Structure formats: structure tokens, C-alpha cells
Amino acid sequence: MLKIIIPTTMLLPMTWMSKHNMIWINATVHSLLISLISLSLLNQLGENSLNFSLTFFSDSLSAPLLVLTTWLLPLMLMASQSHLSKETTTRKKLYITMLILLQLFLIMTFTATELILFYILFEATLVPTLIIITRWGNQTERLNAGLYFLFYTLAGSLPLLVALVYIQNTTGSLNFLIIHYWSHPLSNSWSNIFMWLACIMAFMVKMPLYGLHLWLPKAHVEAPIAGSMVLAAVLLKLGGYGMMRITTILNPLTNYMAYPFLMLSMWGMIMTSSICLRQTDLKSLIAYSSVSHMALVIVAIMIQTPWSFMGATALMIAHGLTSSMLFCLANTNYERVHSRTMILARGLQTLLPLMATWWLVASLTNLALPPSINLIGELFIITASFSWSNITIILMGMNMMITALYSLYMLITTQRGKYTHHINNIKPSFTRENALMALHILPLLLLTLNPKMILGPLY
């Protein structure tokens, strides 16, 4: 596993000793090479995980997430260099350093064998994101956003830490293999109920669960483009992955402790999809769409079935790619017109045809068109939910409708109609932007040919 970690660490002195006009080229090339190397973790076993050492291990759940992280770094670098051109050399290197440190923390987080190490890296991911949002965000709200991003996370994660150390006092270990092999049922007691809540609520906040989600619209809207890309594509999944690891010690308590969270997820999925229908800010719409998809992921993890776990893994990967692409698409128009109001710039298909094609494909994957992996995950989760209770289809189907209704709505508002007359500074699409869209969209489509590679351990 060090064959991934050490090159990522070497990215830091490489960017700090590069020429002033070579930082982007070097960082992009070497992050792409690191992604190519990380692509070898996809060879998984079935029976058990790849246990490299006492500290790091790779699973069929971890490997797609690691590949997505390593692939997302070069895309973030490509998307950042446009609006950071006027920046000084030192601050550009500091921005790249924040991105590299975030990738390093995420890579170590997804492969830690022991739950305290996972928790420490899980919290360590906070600091670079906070610095990125509050230093390179554009508006005055970013500061408030940063605070919301911070104290929502910590207020959830501080109890988890306590629970974790408590567990190691009674079990004797926090190694995940030992935890899984020596797992014992949780009795029906108040102490067990509160330990369950302490083990779950941090990942709930990270998802975010409906009702604990107010930090996400602020943080994703106010962040720079690379911040939004990493926040939506990878950071949210830190919750899901965490849940998939920690529910192994929460049975059979989850059989009834999950009812309020399931109700919140289903109803708030309806609520956030409906919120997307009346949204004036284009980034806010994408953020709320992420909330709805993550609610579906929460339902999948809470019902604890192999089909639901497979669907949750697939949906996590697919949503990461799609939401990153949508954020980049919105940022292109924002850099055109310096406003996030969705109705300001209209009829853009007339002026930017290829970018309109990119918009269309992103909207199609957002509404889960078959046979995309978005629908693969969604359908697996819906089938598992139907087995859990047949009435769930009523909500699930409703969500589907609303999702399409807002997706095309976005597409119709920004691409169709007539162009705004007074906006006359809409330049042709750069090769950088088109390449970024392609590098988002093509892996997503290729994953359809080999879906099992993202279906997780339960496959």
C-alpha cells in the first residue's frame, strides 16, 4: 500500500521545488501516474481482503473509492488552474499542497485496518478542506460556511471517539478483522442504545442525513471548484464507508434503532428532490441533488442486505463522478458570467454546442438512465427496499419522478430557449474544459461494461 502512499507524499516536494510555470504540468502528470498505479488495487479476492500489513488493508469496498480519489486529484488540478492564474507562485503551491494533503489523508483513511487510525485520518481530512473553503472561496459567506462545515462534523465525531475507546476497553482491540471475527450481539439496553447512537451519528452527519444536512448547501456553494468536487465526490462517501464498517457490531440493535433514520431518509429524499424544483442558484440545486442521492444510500446501508450494500457501493461511485461533472459544468458558466443565478444565462446550446452535449450526458446520468451504474445502484437499493417493505416503492418511485423533473429542468433552463441579449462575453469552450468533462464522463460509461468492479464485497 506504500507504493501508493509514498509517491503521493513525494508530490509535495515535487511541487515545492518546481519552476513557477511548471507546477500544474508536473502535478497533473504525476497524479495521473499515481492513479494508474492505484488502478492495480482492483484485483480483489472474494473470500477475504488484501491485507498488505498490520496497518493497511484493501477490500472490494475500499479499492473503487481509492481509485476515485486518485483519479479526482488530476481533475481538480485541471479545474483549479483557470481561476488561480492571477495567484502568486507561493499561494498556488500552497493550494496544490492542500489538495495533495487531502488526497493523502483520504487514501490512508480508506485503507486503515484499525478504527482509531481511521478516525484520526477521518478527522484530519477536515483541515485542508476548511483551509481551501475559507481561503480561496469567492464570497463573504465562505467563512460562515467553514464554521458550519466544521462544527457539524465535530459535534458528530466527538461522541464516536468516546465510543471507540470504550469499545477497545471491553473488546480489547479495534482491528477491523478482529472486530468482524469476534463480533457479538448488542443487547436491548439504554447503554447499548446510546453506544449505537455514538457509533452512527458521525457518519449520519457526514452523509448528510436529512435534518443534519444544512452545512452541505453552504459549504458546497461557497467553496472553490476543487473544494466542491472533492466534497461531493469523495468526502460524503466517508460517511457511507464508515457505516458499512461499523454496522458489523451493531446487530441486532439496528433492527429497530434504524426506523427514525429510515423515515428521515425516505421523506427527506422526497423533500430535497422537491427543493431542487424551486432553486435560483445552480450550485445549490446540485448540492440538494447530492443530499437526495445520499439519503437513498443511507436507506441501503440501514436495511443491511447484500443487495442493498451492493447498490450503495455502486451509487456512491456513480454519484461521485456525476456530481463532480455537474459542478464543473456549472463552474464553466460561472467563470463566463460571474453569477450563479440559473436564469441569468440562457439558450447556451446556441452558443456552446459541445458543452451542451456534456450538460445533456451529465443530466442523463443524474436521473439514472439505463444501463448507467447510477441506475444499477438505484435499482438494487429499490429492490432491497421493496423486500424490506413493499410500500417503500411508493416513495422510491416518487423520488425517481422528481429527480427527472429537476434534472431536465436544469438542462432546459440553462441550455434551451433564447440567449440573453446583453450577455456578450461568452467565449468558445477551451480544450481544458472539454477535456475535463470527457475525463469525468468516459470512465463512468466504461464502468457499465464491468459493473462488478464497483459492486463491492457482497458481489
Binding site: 498490520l54 496497518t55 486503515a112 485496518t113 484499525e114 482509531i116 487510525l117 477497545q168 479495534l174
Partner: protein, 57 residues
């Protein structure tokens, strides 16, 4: 025939020969509690290191 003792003589520490047996436990002491046993053996390195949470040393 009584000679007055010189200066410094009555303050001497002297010896006494007695048939009285020397008392064994004049303080009436109880039996002293047994001490903690001892430390013994050779010092081996700690098994699997410190065994702190994730540290392998």
C-alpha cells in the same frame, strides 16, 4: 575513707553486670506484615511493542 569523685567522673557511661534477662519485646510489638515479594527475572522486550491503538512498535 571516702574520696570525693573528681570532675568528670559521675557523668561517665559505665557497665552493669546483672542476672536479669534481657527483655525480648519491650515495645510489645505485633508481628510485622510481610513485604511485597520481589522483582526477579530477566528483562524481555515488550510483546508486540507498546500495543497502543495502531502503533506496531
Amino acid at each position: 575513707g571516702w574520696v570525693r569523685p573528681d570532675l568528670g567522673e559521675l557523668s561517665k557511661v559505665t557497665k552493669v553486670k546483672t542476672d536479669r534477662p534481657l527483655p525480648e519485646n519491650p515495645y510489645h510489638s505485633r508481628a510485622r506484615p510481610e513485604p511485597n515479594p520481589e522483582a526477579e527475572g530477566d528483562l524481555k522486550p515488550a510483546k508486540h511493542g507498546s500495543r497502543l491503538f495502531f502503533w506496531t512498535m
